[PDB]
Amino acid sequence: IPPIPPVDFAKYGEIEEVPMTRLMQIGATNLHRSWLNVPHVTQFESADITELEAFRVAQKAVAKKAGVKLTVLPLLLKACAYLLKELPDFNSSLAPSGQALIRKKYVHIGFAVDTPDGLLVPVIRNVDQKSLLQLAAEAAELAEKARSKKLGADAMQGACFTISSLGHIGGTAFTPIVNAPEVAILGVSKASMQPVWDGKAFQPRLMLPLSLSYDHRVINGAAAARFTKRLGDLLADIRAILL
Amino acid sequence: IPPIPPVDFAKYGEIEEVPMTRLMQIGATNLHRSWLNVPHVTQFESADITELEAFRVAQKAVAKKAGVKLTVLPLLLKACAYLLKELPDFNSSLAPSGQALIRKKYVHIGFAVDTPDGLLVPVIRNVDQKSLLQLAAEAAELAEKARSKKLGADAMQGACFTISSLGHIGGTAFTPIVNAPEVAILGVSKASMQPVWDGKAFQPRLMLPLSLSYDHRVINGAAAARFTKRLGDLLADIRAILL
Amino acid sequence: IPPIPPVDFAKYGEIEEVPMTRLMQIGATNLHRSWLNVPHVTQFESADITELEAFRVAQKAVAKKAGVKLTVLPLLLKACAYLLKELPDFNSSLAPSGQALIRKKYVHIGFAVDTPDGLLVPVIRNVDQKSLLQLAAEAAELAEKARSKKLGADAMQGACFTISSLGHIGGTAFTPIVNAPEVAILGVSKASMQPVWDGKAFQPRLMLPLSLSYDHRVINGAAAARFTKRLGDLLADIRAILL
Ligand SMILES: O=S([O-])[O-]
Ligand SMILES: O=S([O-])[O-]
Ligand SMILES: O=S([O-])[O-]
């Protein structure tokens, strides 16, 4: 890999050198390792979350009683956990030989937290076994631990899949990097009101932008487009998780 | 290229190792070879296909008589073949020295077929010479051969360009990988009804999402944006292929 | 990096070998160097530029008197220069050790010009110090020099950030390559009239598609989504640059 030539940046004006934290350096190295090893594709999709939002908001007091805040992340975690079991190849890693897949029979999912010192991705174990309020409690606990530098490296291991949600900040879509040896990552951006054709007129529906990057060595185009379509369906009516 | 560290995945739960087919392994290797050799950009565009869809549907019985099904692929194949001749740099490969281009004077186009054993990309030769019903017949024949493992490696050689259509499954857009030594690939996702401003009001138009990835060593930004704009124009009125 | 196997392209029909200019070859090499060194993410956003367009058009005669044409580029240059000072990490380069950042205290911005011989990126120095008509005059001068092969390599050095605008040609969005050692590049595509929910109904607003690619070793997801959100805000009301 050819290196970037050094440039005397001070020839063009004043510069200031500030050091990178160790977390930023670990991160830089893992990202660059994933980038070069994984042939990335991003598949974009929009999910209609009008009803899902109404549910979330109508459970505000039950969430309050439980002392948890209920955001879209536990809902995304539950729906993805259901799909990782339905489409097992997303729940796998490429074996070090490059000639077999290791299918994981558990579902643990990490979620990205951007903290001032760098990115951490805490893992929730057995997501397919926890309820929405359990996941909400857990996600908040791990996020606060991540911010407080109090998270154990123990809790950043064993993920099958990652969710990276920027919806609280903005954006229409992005192309996340797969956290190798995982095979896929779901980016979530900001939901907005969009006109959706019902067959006769455009209705306003609250649409959530989804961006799935995947390792194309393990997942082909039709599989990935089937995963985001199924995820948009489950999010459009999450009672389907019950059958 | 730093390798991904091996992880004992069984520390986190139960695992199952399943082998990769040879096709999946050939594919993994070509994809990773393209990924590292081609600096990729994807240019997105939406084509108004309202009239083109009306045409397709009104020729359903002539297609039936010919025993072919007429989908959007032959139409995409014809329009791309016309543009590969109009903008010759898309119809070329970089010479092994990296200092000349080999401009191809023929137009053969491959199209991706995802089969249970892996991805195959059959090639149709001299697309610019065949009619819409010839291409429809041919594309279906090659697709069935690809599924039946009966396709000759003969028929997976010599493409100038590739079309990867996921529209039958879903999605809004994706970022396909260039099938090197080709210089560009057209991803096609699902068409949907969108409000398009006519100058005074939004009309419902059926819009087809197009995603062109190209090798930026050979094609610059303005060339690629000109190719997708011209493709959206031809698809908005394909009678322009006649002049 | 595995090489692409040579193919006898003439087995499939007639070929023509044409040479690459030196500029195309320099470019191919820098692009491929950036591609392999920078783990790229693209963050997409749409900015409401209805009022900004009305301003641009209402100043047509003052621009004329100044002999400059006022396009959206000087406006983009000023708004980005304001944000590079507000969010200093975008105005930096990774030190050759990979363990510190060099924060630049100046703001020079390059912009891509696609000329028949290849891509050039002229640099405007101290963008944060020039007015909209100064930048308009300068951008046009440098663009004409770039086309006339008369631009000095002097004038292609020292950029902190690059803007690549394809809006004059077309497209909905694209994924530009970071011009390393820079850490981010803003792609701009074609503005179009879109229905935007005001809380009660969809109004037609002129929306500008923005595509920010960044080096994820230096910039994380939340920072990049905050940069495009803030840029969409400044473009929605550029009087905010005054406070
Ligand atoms: O398998 S994808 O390349 O359609
Ligand atoms: O040639 S592109 O980088 O505008
Ligand atoms: O820092 S990004 O991966 O959310």
XYZ file of C-alpha atoms and ligand atoms in Angstrom:
741
model
C 0.000 0.000 0.000
C 1.735 3.185 -1.189
C 2.030 5.707 1.699
C 0.778 9.266 1.552
C 3.820 11.597 0.977
C 4.543 13.938 3.978
C 3.789 17.551 3.386
C 5.259 20.477 5.354
C 1.787 21.813 6.328
C 3.337 24.839 8.011
C 4.386 26.218 4.602
C 0.807 27.286 4.095
C 0.117 28.906 7.415
C 0.100 28.154 11.064
C -0.405 24.586 12.340
C -0.937 22.975 15.742
C -0.173 19.308 16.396
C -2.581 17.576 18.883
C -2.196 13.884 19.796
C -4.579 11.104 19.145
C -5.971 9.157 22.099
C -5.147 5.466 22.272
C -8.831 4.645 21.584
C -8.684 6.745 18.377
C -5.530 4.878 17.397
C -6.997 1.376 18.086
C -10.063 2.474 16.115
C -8.025 3.869 13.184
C -6.220 0.556 12.905
C -9.315 -1.687 13.095
C -11.137 0.512 10.515
C -8.295 0.451 8.123
C -8.011 -3.379 8.608
C -11.729 -3.853 7.814
C -11.531 -1.480 4.853
C -8.787 -3.432 3.104
C -10.140 -6.910 3.941
C -13.874 -6.526 3.227
C -15.179 -5.711 -0.330
C -17.977 -3.407 0.892
C -21.405 -2.774 -0.668
C -24.064 -0.562 0.939
C -27.730 -1.343 0.302
C -30.108 1.550 1.104
C -33.842 1.133 2.063
C -36.521 3.299 3.790
C -38.812 1.762 6.412
C -42.244 3.186 7.150
C -42.206 3.674 10.866
C -45.462 5.727 11.325
C -47.177 3.171 13.511
C -44.002 2.132 15.273
C -43.507 5.738 16.275
C -47.109 5.979 17.565
C -46.495 2.831 19.657
C -43.225 4.240 21.077
C -44.827 7.465 22.079
C -47.985 5.828 23.540
C -45.716 3.646 25.829
C -43.898 6.702 27.233
C -45.349 6.275 30.765
C -44.781 2.448 31.021
C -41.184 3.180 29.956
C -41.028 5.947 32.589
C -42.320 3.564 35.277
C -39.555 1.177 34.256
C -37.189 4.167 34.447
C -35.964 3.423 30.893
C -36.302 5.866 27.969
C -37.775 3.835 24.967
C -35.999 5.043 21.789
C -35.949 3.358 18.334
C -32.715 1.397 19.164
C -34.407 -1.484 21.245
C -36.951 -1.838 18.497
C -34.168 -2.024 15.857
C -32.241 -4.493 18.082
C -35.275 -6.807 18.459
C -36.199 -6.687 14.743
C -32.566 -7.312 13.660
C -32.243 -10.166 16.168
C -35.339 -11.755 14.682
C -33.894 -11.429 11.144
C -30.395 -12.713 12.057
C -32.145 -15.937 13.038
C -34.283 -15.968 9.868
C -31.371 -15.271 7.475
C -28.442 -17.106 9.189
C -25.706 -15.948 6.799
C -25.835 -12.466 8.217
C -25.194 -14.067 11.594
C -21.827 -15.561 10.632
C -18.119 -14.835 10.089
C -15.741 -16.065 7.418
C -13.429 -18.796 8.791
C -9.680 -17.768 8.679
C -9.081 -20.121 5.693
C -11.562 -18.150 3.568
C -13.274 -21.447 2.621
C -16.044 -21.929 5.209
C -18.438 -19.787 7.176
C -18.876 -20.029 10.914
C -22.602 -19.771 11.530
C -23.263 -18.450 14.960
C -26.184 -19.912 16.853
C -26.330 -16.991 19.327
C -27.368 -13.370 18.572
C -25.308 -10.690 20.312
C -25.423 -7.172 18.705
C -23.089 -4.269 19.249
C -24.137 -0.610 18.827
C -21.752 2.306 18.178
C -21.399 5.030 20.827
C -19.230 8.020 19.831
C -17.554 9.287 23.000
C -15.066 12.269 23.243
C -12.160 9.881 23.417
C -13.221 7.739 20.420
C -15.724 5.188 19.225
C -16.745 2.247 21.377
C -19.160 -0.506 20.316
C -20.687 -2.197 23.519
C -22.313 -5.566 22.901
C -25.747 -6.797 24.190
C -25.770 -10.541 24.547
C -28.768 -12.767 23.537
C -30.832 -9.870 22.118
C -33.303 -12.401 20.837
C -34.069 -13.318 24.419
C -34.654 -9.852 25.906
C -37.815 -7.724 25.852
C -37.984 -4.130 24.611
C -37.702 -2.640 28.104
C -34.810 -4.932 29.058
C -32.925 -3.872 25.936
C -33.758 -0.229 26.584
C -32.348 -0.464 30.131
C -29.283 -2.329 29.008
C -28.477 -0.090 26.041
C -28.602 2.996 28.268
C -26.418 1.344 30.965
C -23.765 0.288 28.454
C -23.828 3.696 26.746
C -23.243 5.493 30.048
C -20.462 3.053 30.955
C -18.880 3.700 27.537
C -18.953 7.480 28.165
C -17.632 7.175 31.683
C -14.647 5.117 30.438
C -16.050 2.400 32.763
C -16.909 -0.267 30.162
C -15.068 -3.600 30.419
C -13.372 -4.979 27.181
C -15.291 -8.042 28.164
C -18.429 -6.091 27.004
C -16.953 -5.243 23.579
C -16.537 -8.811 22.521
C -18.513 -11.395 20.734
C -20.941 -9.317 18.546
C -22.566 -10.929 15.583
C -23.695 -7.656 13.938
C -23.576 -3.898 14.683
C -26.115 -1.098 14.519
C -24.752 2.442 14.047
C -27.517 5.025 14.639
C -26.970 8.655 13.697
C -30.686 9.481 13.571
C -30.469 11.619 16.660
C -28.028 13.944 14.808
C -29.104 14.089 11.160
C -28.444 12.883 7.667
C -30.244 11.124 4.958
C -28.054 7.966 4.631
C -24.342 7.037 5.042
C -22.102 4.080 4.056
C -20.888 2.468 7.362
C -17.760 0.278 7.496
C -18.309 -3.394 8.425
C -16.779 -4.233 11.765
C -14.868 -7.280 10.540
C -14.977 -10.307 11.404
C -18.707 -9.448 11.353
C -20.268 -9.631 7.899
C -22.792 -6.676 7.978
C -23.596 -3.385 9.852
C -26.883 -1.397 9.804
C -26.580 2.412 9.628
C -29.716 4.298 10.717
C -30.153 7.994 9.843
C -32.783 10.643 10.640
C -36.480 9.796 10.098
C -38.539 12.365 8.217
C -42.024 12.772 6.842
C -42.179 11.714 3.154
C -45.011 11.396 0.577
C -45.628 7.765 -0.127
C -47.969 6.656 -2.907
C -50.872 4.555 -1.637
C -52.016 3.606 -5.106
C -54.071 6.724 -5.654
C -52.427 9.634 -3.731
C -49.342 10.482 -1.695
C -49.955 10.112 2.064
C -47.412 11.562 4.625
C -45.549 8.572 6.229
C -42.646 8.838 8.712
C -39.769 7.096 6.874
C -36.573 5.814 8.544
C -33.479 5.661 6.212
C -31.562 2.370 6.565
C -28.055 1.733 5.108
C -26.805 -1.828 5.305
C -23.105 -2.354 4.442
C -22.114 -5.931 3.919
C -19.131 -8.052 3.061
C -19.838 -9.168 -0.495
C -17.518 -12.220 -0.159
C -20.215 -13.755 2.104
C -23.385 -11.869 1.050
C -24.587 -11.223 -2.427
C -26.755 -8.436 -3.658
C -30.119 -10.310 -3.623
C -29.590 -11.521 -0.050
C -28.767 -8.042 1.202
C -31.743 -6.427 -0.639
C -33.947 -9.206 0.850
C -32.598 -8.426 4.372
C -33.376 -4.707 4.155
C -36.797 -5.323 2.571
C -37.715 -7.791 5.342
C -36.372 -5.351 7.975
C -38.546 -2.522 6.495
C -41.553 -4.891 6.682
C -40.956 -5.857 10.287
C -40.541 -2.220 11.218
C -43.737 -1.343 9.305
C -45.578 -3.896 11.531
C -43.627 -5.351 14.349
C -46.488 -7.637 15.435
C -45.020 -9.911 12.726
C -42.211 -10.733 15.205
C -44.881 -12.672 17.124
C -45.687 -15.384 14.649
C -2.888 -6.008 3.962
C -3.169 -6.719 7.702
C -5.246 -9.899 8.307
C -8.283 -10.061 10.544
C -7.235 -11.718 13.888
C -8.913 -15.159 14.482
C -11.487 -15.220 17.193
C -12.671 -18.335 19.060
C -16.350 -17.734 18.115
C -17.457 -20.681 20.232
C -16.567 -18.751 23.411
C -19.762 -16.806 22.951
C -22.157 -19.614 22.240
C -22.712 -22.422 19.857
C -21.299 -22.304 16.307
C -21.659 -24.429 13.175
C -19.062 -24.410 10.396
C -20.512 -24.805 6.830
C -18.256 -24.802 3.744
C -18.204 -22.351 0.947
C -18.887 -23.587 -2.583
C -16.101 -23.196 -5.115
C -18.192 -20.562 -6.962
C -18.469 -18.530 -3.719
C -14.709 -18.830 -3.309
C -13.900 -17.760 -6.927
C -16.329 -14.873 -6.422
C -14.834 -13.839 -3.046
C -11.413 -13.666 -4.651
C -12.448 -11.688 -7.760
C -14.436 -9.208 -5.590
C -11.610 -8.649 -3.245
C -9.231 -8.208 -6.265
C -11.528 -5.560 -7.811
C -11.996 -3.827 -4.462
C -8.284 -3.263 -3.909
C -7.445 -2.378 -7.534
C -10.290 -0.009 -8.476
C -10.793 3.373 -6.650
C -14.613 3.182 -6.699
C -17.147 6.031 -6.903
C -20.912 5.474 -7.153
C -23.028 8.047 -8.987
C -26.771 7.838 -8.203
C -29.591 9.034 -10.580
C -33.376 8.401 -10.933
C -34.892 7.786 -14.370
C -38.529 8.538 -15.115
C -39.805 5.328 -16.569
C -43.610 6.061 -16.624
C -43.962 5.778 -20.373
C -41.431 2.994 -20.684
C -43.494 0.990 -18.237
C -46.700 1.677 -20.224
C -44.918 0.452 -23.385
C -43.690 -2.728 -21.631
C -47.103 -3.577 -20.365
C -48.894 -2.772 -23.671
C -46.501 -5.242 -25.493
C -47.348 -8.100 -23.101
C -49.145 -10.174 -25.791
C -46.492 -9.687 -28.576
C -43.935 -10.807 -25.965
C -46.194 -13.769 -25.107
C -46.469 -14.724 -28.793
C -42.678 -14.660 -28.921
C -42.743 -16.777 -25.745
C -40.408 -14.270 -24.027
C -41.332 -12.316 -20.872
C -40.405 -8.576 -21.550
C -38.929 -7.159 -18.305
C -36.939 -3.900 -17.849
C -33.556 -5.709 -18.372
C -33.667 -5.833 -22.304
C -34.621 -2.195 -22.293
C -31.697 -1.370 -19.944
C -29.372 -3.541 -22.098
C -30.369 -1.729 -25.327
C -30.125 1.770 -23.788
C -26.722 0.995 -22.181
C -25.450 -0.503 -25.449
C -26.421 2.691 -27.233
C -24.567 4.797 -24.618
C -21.412 2.614 -24.557
C -21.063 3.514 -28.229
C -21.789 7.212 -27.591
C -19.365 7.542 -24.640
C -16.527 5.125 -25.636
C -14.513 5.422 -22.411
C -17.084 3.423 -20.530
C -16.561 0.725 -23.144
C -12.870 0.208 -22.369
C -10.367 -1.397 -19.974
C -7.114 -0.074 -18.573
C -4.109 -1.669 -20.340
C -1.875 -3.727 -17.912
C 0.800 -0.962 -17.961
C -1.671 1.535 -16.470
C -0.723 4.025 -19.226
C -3.223 3.408 -22.050
C -6.844 2.440 -22.419
C -8.046 -0.361 -24.640
C -11.172 0.940 -26.333
C -13.395 -1.897 -27.312
C -15.231 -1.612 -30.598
C -17.767 -4.331 -29.673
C -20.514 -4.116 -26.997
C -21.045 -7.278 -24.952
C -22.804 -6.799 -21.539
C -22.938 -9.168 -18.618
C -25.807 -9.233 -16.081
C -25.584 -10.648 -12.537
C -27.673 -13.711 -11.635
C -27.565 -14.750 -7.955
C -27.926 -18.533 -7.852
C -27.908 -20.752 -4.656
C -24.338 -21.744 -5.317
C -23.035 -18.188 -5.906
C -23.063 -15.287 -8.310
C -22.652 -15.792 -12.039
C -22.530 -12.993 -14.626
C -23.536 -14.432 -18.142
C -22.570 -12.238 -21.080
C -24.766 -11.256 -24.110
C -22.634 -10.577 -27.133
C -23.280 -7.663 -29.593
C -26.185 -6.198 -27.572
C -26.177 -3.247 -29.905
C -27.178 -5.581 -32.700
C -30.102 -7.403 -31.059
C -33.743 -6.315 -30.763
C -35.688 -6.130 -27.497
C -37.320 -9.536 -27.978
C -34.029 -11.190 -28.959
C -32.397 -9.836 -25.808
C -35.385 -10.887 -23.723
C -35.148 -14.463 -25.059
C -31.418 -14.600 -24.614
C -31.347 -13.133 -21.105
C -33.899 -15.701 -19.922
C -31.998 -18.600 -21.582
C -28.685 -17.592 -20.011
C -30.312 -17.028 -16.610
C -31.849 -20.509 -16.636
C -28.540 -22.029 -17.752
C -26.807 -20.172 -14.897
C -29.300 -21.626 -12.374
C -29.081 -25.114 -13.787
C -25.262 -25.060 -13.461
C -25.320 -25.574 -17.268
C -23.659 -22.310 -18.364
C -20.345 -22.592 -20.236
C -17.360 -20.420 -18.956
C -17.233 -19.478 -22.579
C -20.449 -17.443 -21.859
C -18.915 -15.578 -18.893
C -16.174 -13.998 -20.896
C -15.624 -10.865 -22.808
C -18.103 -8.372 -21.182
C -17.552 -4.694 -21.625
C -19.917 -3.611 -18.810
C -22.284 -5.252 -16.282
C -25.829 -4.558 -15.158
C -26.799 -5.765 -11.663
C -30.589 -5.525 -11.173
C -32.099 -5.957 -7.723
C -35.357 -4.194 -8.615
C -37.317 -7.401 -8.432
C -36.370 -7.700 -4.717
C -36.274 -4.186 -3.257
C -34.103 -1.327 -2.160
C -33.666 2.266 -2.916
C -30.034 2.245 -4.215
C -26.796 0.276 -3.546
C -23.069 0.723 -4.347
C -22.088 -2.201 -6.690
C -18.457 -3.323 -7.086
C -16.920 -2.869 -10.562
C -16.175 -6.180 -12.202
C -12.576 -5.348 -13.092
C -11.077 -5.227 -15.860
C -14.385 -3.529 -16.768
C -14.509 0.154 -15.860
C -18.203 0.599 -14.732
C -21.292 -1.388 -13.508
C -24.945 -0.204 -13.375
C -26.954 -1.191 -10.273
C -30.741 -0.996 -10.716
C -33.049 -1.005 -7.668
C -36.834 -1.019 -7.173
C -38.959 1.506 -9.118
C -41.538 3.434 -7.114
C -44.030 6.218 -7.605
C -42.508 9.610 -6.646
C -43.746 13.244 -6.813
C -41.841 15.068 -9.479
C -42.181 18.825 -9.936
C -43.450 19.779 -13.390
C -42.798 23.460 -12.878
C -46.065 24.145 -11.116
C -47.097 20.983 -9.166
C -45.839 17.533 -8.221
C -47.101 14.835 -10.624
C -46.754 11.070 -9.713
C -43.996 9.578 -11.981
C -42.646 6.000 -11.776
C -38.937 6.515 -10.963
C -36.218 3.859 -11.405
C -33.163 4.264 -9.050
C -29.844 3.854 -10.904
C -26.426 3.454 -9.175
C -23.403 3.578 -11.440
C -20.068 2.563 -9.839
C -17.035 3.415 -11.868
C -13.285 3.166 -11.784
C -12.180 6.743 -11.168
C -8.695 6.082 -12.662
C -10.419 5.968 -16.091
C -13.649 7.948 -15.487
C -13.994 11.255 -13.786
C -16.962 12.646 -11.986
C -18.378 14.792 -14.852
C -18.226 11.890 -17.315
C -20.035 9.548 -14.949
C -22.742 12.150 -14.078
C -23.138 12.745 -17.858
C -23.550 8.960 -18.438
C -26.306 8.575 -15.843
C -28.080 11.762 -16.979
C -28.045 10.572 -20.612
C -29.215 7.097 -19.496
C -32.145 8.685 -17.544
C -33.036 10.653 -20.709
C -32.989 7.627 -22.972
C -35.112 5.715 -20.502
C -37.522 8.676 -20.247
C -37.982 8.423 -24.067
C -36.408 5.490 -25.737
C -37.485 6.622 -29.222
C -34.279 8.702 -28.979
C -32.347 5.455 -29.637
C -33.715 5.714 -33.191
C -32.021 8.859 -34.363
C -2.535 -6.279 -3.779
C -3.338 -9.039 -6.290
C -3.158 -7.676 -9.882
C -5.954 -7.951 -12.403
C -5.083 -10.811 -14.870
C -4.442 -9.572 -18.485
C -7.080 -10.497 -20.967
C -6.610 -10.640 -24.756
C -9.481 -8.163 -25.395
C -9.123 -8.595 -29.147
C -10.476 -12.162 -28.881
C -13.922 -10.674 -28.537
C -13.846 -8.160 -31.330
C -11.931 -5.193 -32.513
C -9.972 -3.006 -30.064
C -8.116 0.305 -30.276
C -5.417 1.285 -27.782
C -5.301 5.059 -26.930
C -2.765 6.469 -24.441
C -3.435 8.120 -21.177
C -2.247 11.694 -20.655
C 0.304 12.279 -17.920
C -2.346 14.179 -15.899
C -4.656 11.121 -16.083
C -1.759 8.966 -14.915
C -0.807 11.268 -11.969
C -4.504 11.333 -11.064
C -4.918 7.530 -11.317
C -2.011 7.087 -8.937
C -3.131 9.665 -6.338
C -6.704 8.238 -6.380
C -5.552 4.736 -5.917
C -3.204 5.917 -3.075
C -6.100 7.668 -1.279
C -8.404 4.696 -1.824
C -6.099 2.226 -0.094
C -5.012 4.566 2.729
C -8.317 6.166 3.782
C -11.221 4.044 5.227
C -13.967 6.056 3.483
C -17.527 6.768 4.666
C -19.958 9.012 2.768
C -22.594 10.929 4.727
C -25.499 12.219 2.590
C -27.692 15.293 3.475
C -30.063 17.652 1.562
C -29.900 21.408 2.155
C -32.885 23.660 1.548
C -31.523 26.327 -0.706
C -34.811 28.100 -1.740
C -33.886 31.442 -0.247
C -30.226 31.140 -1.127
C -31.243 30.676 -4.733
C -33.526 33.752 -4.591
C -30.591 35.778 -3.197
C -28.236 34.530 -5.953
C -30.639 35.422 -8.674
C -31.570 38.843 -7.188
C -27.792 39.778 -7.139
C -27.366 38.965 -10.850
C -26.742 42.622 -11.852
C -24.279 43.458 -8.976
C -22.394 40.306 -10.032
C -22.551 41.496 -13.661
C -21.182 44.920 -12.676
C -18.334 43.102 -10.953
C -17.977 41.059 -14.158
C -18.191 37.822 -12.117
C -20.917 35.181 -12.593
C -22.279 34.313 -9.029
C -22.901 30.529 -8.935
C -23.483 28.313 -5.847
C -19.710 27.507 -5.520
C -18.649 30.839 -3.714
C -21.552 30.374 -1.368
C -20.486 26.752 -0.664
C -16.849 27.917 -0.255
C -17.806 30.617 2.294
C -20.141 28.325 4.287
C -17.553 25.486 4.350
C -14.808 27.926 5.374
C -16.969 29.066 8.264
C -17.549 25.434 9.354
C -13.882 24.357 9.009
C -13.160 26.979 11.658
C -16.099 25.867 13.836
C -15.276 22.128 13.654
C -11.420 22.142 13.522
C -10.960 18.392 13.006
C -12.207 18.649 9.466
C -9.484 21.235 8.940
C -6.608 18.870 9.732
C -4.413 16.047 8.393
C -3.140 12.914 10.083
C 0.558 13.269 11.027
C 2.813 10.671 9.214
C 3.180 8.654 12.471
C -0.582 8.026 12.574
C -0.613 9.182 16.228
C -1.355 12.929 16.097
C -3.399 15.305 14.008
C -2.018 18.462 12.476
C -4.690 21.097 12.971
C -4.395 23.754 10.363
C -5.052 27.315 11.426
C -5.581 28.527 7.830
C -8.505 27.647 5.500
C -7.565 27.041 1.866
C -10.105 24.987 -0.209
C -9.580 23.254 -3.508
C -12.390 22.621 -6.033
C -12.338 19.950 -8.766
C -12.318 21.045 -12.421
C -12.615 18.221 -14.985
C -10.645 19.291 -18.056
C -10.170 17.215 -21.313
C -6.709 16.218 -20.221
C -7.701 15.135 -16.680
C -8.809 16.387 -13.303
C -7.182 19.386 -11.664
C -8.064 20.739 -8.210
C -7.001 24.515 -7.987
C -6.791 25.888 -4.458
C -8.208 29.242 -3.146
C -6.188 30.488 -0.229
C -7.753 32.093 2.924
C -11.367 31.512 1.798
C -12.496 32.674 5.193
C -11.089 36.083 4.384
C -12.642 36.670 0.948
C -16.115 37.978 0.079
C -18.578 36.216 -2.226
C -17.632 38.310 -5.261
C -13.897 37.887 -4.630
C -14.339 34.118 -4.471
C -16.524 34.172 -7.570
C -13.837 36.074 -9.517
C -11.070 33.865 -8.257
C -12.851 30.558 -8.854
C -13.552 31.527 -12.469
C -9.932 32.684 -13.036
C -8.471 29.462 -11.643
C -10.959 27.330 -13.592
C -10.021 29.019 -16.869
C -6.315 28.665 -16.062
C -6.903 24.960 -15.333
C -8.593 24.508 -18.743
C -5.951 26.460 -20.593
C -3.198 24.255 -19.091
C -1.898 27.557 -17.620
C -2.307 26.786 -13.898
C 0.865 26.734 -11.777
C 1.459 23.617 -9.496
C 1.975 26.301 -6.934
C -1.861 26.802 -7.115
C -2.633 23.104 -6.519
C -0.973 22.970 -3.165
C -1.918 23.465 0.390
C -5.721 22.730 0.420
C -7.392 21.874 3.660
C -10.587 20.464 2.081
C -12.073 19.991 -1.420
C -15.462 20.670 -2.958
C -16.419 18.584 -6.015
C -19.547 20.028 -7.686
C -21.364 18.052 -10.364
C -24.629 19.974 -9.971
C -24.230 21.635 -13.324
C -24.350 18.170 -14.989
C -26.783 16.014 -13.009
C -27.163 13.281 -10.464
C -28.783 12.761 -7.181
C -25.685 12.010 -5.010
C -22.249 10.334 -5.457
C -19.495 9.004 -3.139
C -16.366 11.195 -3.777
C -12.853 9.983 -2.888
C -11.023 11.960 -0.169
C -8.030 13.789 -1.549
C -5.579 12.497 1.051
C -3.770 13.996 3.151
C -7.031 15.973 3.483
C -9.580 14.340 5.770
C -12.934 15.155 3.980
C -14.399 16.210 0.555
C -17.893 17.635 -0.166
C -19.657 16.341 -3.304
C -22.503 18.562 -4.546
C -25.063 17.212 -7.043
C -28.038 18.712 -8.907
C -30.622 20.737 -6.934
C -34.264 19.886 -7.561
C -37.676 20.831 -6.267
C -38.827 18.401 -3.526
C -41.892 18.229 -1.215
C -40.828 18.999 2.297
C -43.213 18.582 5.226
C -43.799 21.825 7.120
C -45.656 20.128 9.933
C -49.005 20.143 8.191
C -48.416 19.867 4.390
C -45.656 19.341 1.843
C -44.334 22.651 0.453
C -42.062 22.694 -2.704
C -38.475 23.560 -1.539
C -35.368 23.631 -3.778
C -33.108 20.961 -2.215
C -29.349 20.639 -2.854
C -27.935 17.055 -2.415
C -24.686 17.019 -0.396
C -22.345 13.975 -0.104
C -19.529 14.290 2.396
C -16.846 11.552 2.251
C -14.523 11.480 5.191
C -11.575 9.586 6.554
C -13.057 7.603 9.428
C -9.632 7.251 11.148
C -9.927 10.977 12.028
C -13.709 11.596 11.857
C -16.416 9.516 13.373
C -19.973 9.167 12.274
C -21.546 11.693 14.718
C -19.020 14.394 13.804
C -19.621 13.955 10.089
C -23.455 13.930 10.479
C -23.081 17.095 12.634
C -20.963 18.754 9.879
C -23.512 18.100 7.130
C -26.449 19.110 9.354
C -24.720 22.396 10.267
C -23.819 22.957 6.584
C -27.508 22.413 5.575
C -28.498 24.967 8.255
C -26.031 27.588 7.104
C -27.154 27.110 3.530
C -30.813 27.352 4.623
C -29.967 30.800 6.128
C -26.569 32.139 5.401
C -27.110 35.265 7.528
C -26.012 32.916 10.346
C -22.431 33.322 9.032
C -22.649 36.876 10.408
C -22.941 36.181 14.090
O -24.453 -10.523 -6.110
S -24.629 -8.854 -6.530
O -23.409 -8.594 -7.273
O -25.832 -8.867 -7.364
O -13.311 14.046 -11.374
S -14.330 14.052 -9.976
O -13.366 13.984 -8.894
O -15.001 15.349 -10.085
O -18.233 6.464 14.584
S -19.383 5.823 13.463
O -18.912 4.462 13.285
O -20.636 5.917 14.214
